[PDB]
């Protein structure tokens, strides 16, 4: 089977310096594997998890 | 053209082991 945690697509390239935080451009479709801290969450995009900001994905269907 | 937010100082560590995936805990696996 296959489990899901949530969805937020993205609006800003956030640079990632750091290894947990999950790099994303503007407008994406990351995976949401679950929140975080409600200021970021889970981020698994292409075969690498890692997180990021919620602030950068108002998110459009969970 | 939009100007990103100037992202924050990221979930501590723990939390996220708290509230992520054991791969992501990879990562940081810091704690407090």
Known sequence: QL???????????????????????????????????????????????????????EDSAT | SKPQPAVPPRPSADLILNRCSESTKRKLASAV
């Open chain 1, 3 to 57: 489990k899901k945690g949530s969805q937020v697509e993205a609006l800003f390239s956030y640079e990632a310096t750091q290894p947990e935080d999950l790099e994303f451009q503007e407008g994406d479709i990351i995976l949401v594997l679950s929140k975080v801290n409600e200021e970021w969450l889970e981020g698994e995009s292409k075969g690498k998890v890692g997180i990021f900001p919620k602030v950068f994905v």
